[PDB]
Amino acid sequence: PSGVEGAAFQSRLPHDRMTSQEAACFPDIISGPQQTQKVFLFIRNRTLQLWLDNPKIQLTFEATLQQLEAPYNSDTVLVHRVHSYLERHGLINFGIYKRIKPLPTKKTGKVIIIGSGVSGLAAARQLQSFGMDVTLLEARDRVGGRVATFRKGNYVADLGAMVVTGLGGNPMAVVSKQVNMELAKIKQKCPLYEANGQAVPKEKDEMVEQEFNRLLEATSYLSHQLDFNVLNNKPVSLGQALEVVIQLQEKHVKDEQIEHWKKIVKTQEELKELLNKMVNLKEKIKELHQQYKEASEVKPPRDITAEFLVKSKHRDLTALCKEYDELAETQGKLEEKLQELEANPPSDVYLSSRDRQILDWHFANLEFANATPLSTLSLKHWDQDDDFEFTGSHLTVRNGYSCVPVALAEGLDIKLNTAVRQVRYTASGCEVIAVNTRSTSQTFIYKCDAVLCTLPLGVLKQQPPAVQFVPPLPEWKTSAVQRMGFGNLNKVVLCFDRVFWDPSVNLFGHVGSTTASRGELFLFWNLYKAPILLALVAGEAAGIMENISDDVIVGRCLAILKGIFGSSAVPQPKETVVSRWRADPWARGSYSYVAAGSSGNDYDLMAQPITPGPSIPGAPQPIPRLFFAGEHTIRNYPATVHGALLSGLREAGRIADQFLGAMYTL
Amino acid sequence: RKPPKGMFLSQEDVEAVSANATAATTVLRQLDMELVSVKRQIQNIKQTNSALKEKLDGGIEPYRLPEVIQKCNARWTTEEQLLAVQAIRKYGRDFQAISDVIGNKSVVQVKNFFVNYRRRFNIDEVLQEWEAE
Numbered sequence A: 001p002s003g004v005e006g007a008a009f010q011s012r013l014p015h016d017r018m019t020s021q022e023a024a025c026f027p028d029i030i031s032g033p034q035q036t037q038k039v040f041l042f043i044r045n046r047t048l049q050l051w052l053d054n055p056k057i058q059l060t061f062e063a064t065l066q067q068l069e070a071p072y073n074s075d076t077v078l079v080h081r082v083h084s085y086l087e088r089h090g091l092i093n094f095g096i097y098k099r100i101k102p103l104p105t106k107k108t109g110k111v112i113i114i115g116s117g118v119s120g121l122a123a124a125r126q127l128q129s130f131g132m133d134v135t136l137l138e139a140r141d142r143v144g145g146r147v148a149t150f151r152k153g154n155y156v157a158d159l160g161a162m163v164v165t166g167l168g169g170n171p172m173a174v175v176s177k178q179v180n181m182e183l184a185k186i187k188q189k190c191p192l193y194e195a196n197g198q199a200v201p202k203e204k205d206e207m208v209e210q211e212f213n214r215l216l217e218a219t220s221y222l223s224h225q226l227d228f229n230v231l232n233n234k235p236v237s238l239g240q241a242l243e244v245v246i247q248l249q250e251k252h253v254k255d256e257q258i259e260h261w262k263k264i265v266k267t268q269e270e271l272k273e274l275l276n277k278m279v280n281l282k283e284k285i286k287e288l289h290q291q292y293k294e295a296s297e298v299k300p301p302r303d304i305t306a307e308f309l310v311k312s313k314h315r316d317l318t319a320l321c322k323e324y325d326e327l328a329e330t331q332g333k334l335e336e337k338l339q340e341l342e343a344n345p346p347s348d349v350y351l352s353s354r355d356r357q358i359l360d361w362h363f364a365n366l367e368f369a370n371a372t373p374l375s376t377l378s379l380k381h382w383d384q385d386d387d388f389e390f391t392g393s394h395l396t397v398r399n400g401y402s403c404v405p406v407a408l409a410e411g412l413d414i415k416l417n418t419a420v421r422q423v424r425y426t427a428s429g430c431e432v433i434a435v436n437t438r439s440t441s442q443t444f445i446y447k448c449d450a451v452l453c454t455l456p457l458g459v460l461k462q463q464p465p466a467v468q469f470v471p472p473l474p475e476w477k478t479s480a481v482q483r484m485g486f487g488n489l490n491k492v493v494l495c496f497d498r499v500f501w502d503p504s505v506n507l508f509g510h511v512g513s514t515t516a517s518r519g520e521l522f523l524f525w526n527l528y529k530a531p532i533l534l535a536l537v538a539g540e541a542a543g544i545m546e547n548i549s550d551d552v553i554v555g556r557c558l559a560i561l562k563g564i565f566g567s568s569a570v571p572q573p574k575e576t577v578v579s580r581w582r583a584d585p586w587a588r589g590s591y592s593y594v595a596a597g598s599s600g601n602d603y604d605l606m607a608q609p610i611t612p613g614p615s616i617p618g619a620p621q622p623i624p625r626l627f628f629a630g631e632h633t634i635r636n637y638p639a640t641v642h643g644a645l646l647s648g649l650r651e652a653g654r655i656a657d658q659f660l661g662a663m664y665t666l
Numbered sequence B: 001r002k003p004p005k006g007m008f009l010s011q012e013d014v015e016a017v018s019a020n021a022t023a024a025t026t027v028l029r030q031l032d033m034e035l036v037s038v039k040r041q042i043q044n045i046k047q048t049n050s051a052l053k054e055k056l057d058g059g060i061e062p063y064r065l066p067e068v069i070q071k072c073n074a075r076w077t078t079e080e081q082l083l084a085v086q087a088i089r090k091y092g093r094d095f096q097a098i099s100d101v102i103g104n105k106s107v108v109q110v111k112n113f114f115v116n117y118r119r120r121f122n123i124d125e126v127l128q129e130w131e132a133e
């Protein structure tokens, strides 16, 4: 859409309806009469539009009201509430902007933020934006976390996030305007190359893709129509359903052949029966000829019984010849009906070996996207975020994604090389205890009104703990952490002195000889300016390949590309890097996925902030002091940057509502 | 509420491939055999019918009799009557056959014959005798 309505859409909001959240803060309005609601909505959308139309400078309440024209211009509080509301929940005035109104002289409240991953940074900025004192602690010696980028000479390649999954309602679209990201479309053509080194024929490439896509809709049918969702008390995975669906197709091929050949016999037997009739008829004919022959040898003139005997035998004989000639006809038909049935046999197989290896690629690709074996994905829920897909094509960040977190860390109190070991929260406030990554002993203590945790899910799952909570986290949180999935997927970066591949083609596949090996180096990218080829390890492969020397892994790559591009066309690489995200202790994996047995709900559980018990018993209910953000907290945008930052903005709004109060809710 | 086209999935088979841990390969192996079973039994009847075909070689063409074409006639020769009565005796009511035999009398003429002559050729008696067979 375009107009004001397009601003709403672009801010992930229904242009013609009040959201649940807005209802919470404008309960007067939404319970109010219909007329007023349309006003509100317009104000919001218009205000949004304004922020969007230029996101490089702060949009103030004044500027906003200037551009309103009554009947909407009239009510100045409504405009103020609405503006301040959007301001609070990072719908406007987020990211990198110039600030019209310099900051509150002194700062209210203190927050410690664990992790300088985008979620963290986006919060930090937002809080400081509101005039709180913020300090982030990062175990790494660099911001971004899972926005890692590699730099050396003019070689540049992300090992972390790389892609913006459409700009249509993506808040990263706004950041793209505030920061120079060299955004390139991705040419979606990807040709596959069997084990030997040979492109798969266009003809097959399509047969299998279609079957792959067909098999997927199939699984969804099982789930949502046949309710095939539990097996022996345990919940069904995507992997299982796919096997079942596949088997069922194999089975249906057989059932068809059976029925066909079985239709052949039943006609073959009809022939047998007929021929018997035909042989016995010929036998009775044979003798009946002789009889007629003998009878006509009685030379005339003759008595009438002997004349009758000739005549009668003659007719009795033509009567049988008649019968036999009709059966010769009936036979003719059945001998052809077997030409037909021999000619059109149902398919020999469901899938050849070749077919199934290529199909395994398309599955690897799914294991790539979701960074986990299909064995582990919830059948019911793995694709729950598919409704909130952005529009527009996917783009890579050509200059390296690290440009974004860095940009956010301008003017922020970040303590790098500071690893949190324990978080203490009580009704009075919080102590965070970190150390120096370099010399573990050099110990730090931080006190604050609130902590915001952006620790990755893989870290939260770590046993025994890398971080202690004091008091421990309630079971409802820890159970959700157990149920959630935390996958893995690695990148190998190959740096060369010359482009020895088709520059016209951004990406191109390789087809592993096994099912158990489909993930290993199954996909290659050239998306960058320099001669850099990127190779992916996905699926069950990823976690195993983390126990192999880089040298070897680059070996296996080079081999592949020789086979594809010609043994002498493959120069050795000047520079190589291999990712190991599951190994990485500030990550312990790549990103969340909806494990079988979990739901989207767990994402909400993960976001729920934590409230300590009271200090003195029978003292009033304390405020909540421990907050959570990051990729695993946002139900509708999991495992992405936009989700991280959206969670970041979200928590910042929530914290501010707590510690600064929200005078826009009246 | 419908599978993608050419994908097959009914409630019952789903249950059937799942219940056991190998119920899949069991069922798929049963059919594998149950096929080769029918494939062989085709070979039987092929070869059986191949030998029956060999016995019929020659057709019936050596035993074919020429075509008689007598033009229907109203009169009954004394000869023709005699053939009738013997035919009645041998054939009963297959009036077609009786007409075929006499050579040149319509099947109606044959039927009337029973009525007009029944009187004198005891075609009653004659017919009981055929019945007794």
Ligand SMILES: Cc1cc2nc3c(=O)[nH]c(=O)nc-3n(C[C@H](O)[C@H](O)[C@H](O)COP(=O)(O)OP(=O)(O)OC[C@H]3O[C@@H](n4cnc5c(N)ncnc54)[C@H](O)[C@@H]3O)c2cc1C
Pocket (backbone or CB within 6 Å): A114, A115, A116, A117, A118, A119, A120, A137, A138, A139, A140, A143, A144, A145, A146, A147, A159, A160, A161, A162, A163, A164, A165, A418, A419, A420, A421, A454, A455, A456, A459, A466, A467, A489, A490, A491, A581, A585, A586, A587, A589, A590, A591, A629, A630, A631, A632, A638, A639, A640, A641, A642, A644
């Ligand atoms: C290989 C890969 C490819 C990806 N590709 C894409 C993509 O193409 N597109 C996309 O949109 N998204 C992608 N993502 C997802 C994206 O990287 C994440 O969603 C996002 O960076 C998560 O942000 P976060 O702030 O929640 O967590 P993080 O970015 O991990 O930040 C959390 C921070 O906490 C720090 N930390 C950990 N332990 C401690 C401790 N004890 N003390 C202090 N700090 C600690 C970490 O070092 C880290 O900096 C990808 C992820 C991976 C692994």
Ligand SMILES: CN1CCC(Oc2ccc(OCc3ccccc3NC(=O)c3cc4sccc4n3C)cc2)CC1
Pocket (backbone or CB within 6 Å): A162, A163, A165, A186, A368, A369, A370, A385, A394, A507, A525, A592, A593, A638, A639, A640, A641
């Ligand atoms: C839970 N769910 C997982 C699927 C994610 O969506 C994807 C959509 C398309 C994908 O392939 C496009 C593509 C083509 C060519 C090169 C790279 C990519 N993509 C990525 O490397 C990629 C983009 C995103 S978004 C979150 C991670 C991720 N990855 C890893 C991949 C993932 C959304 C969150």
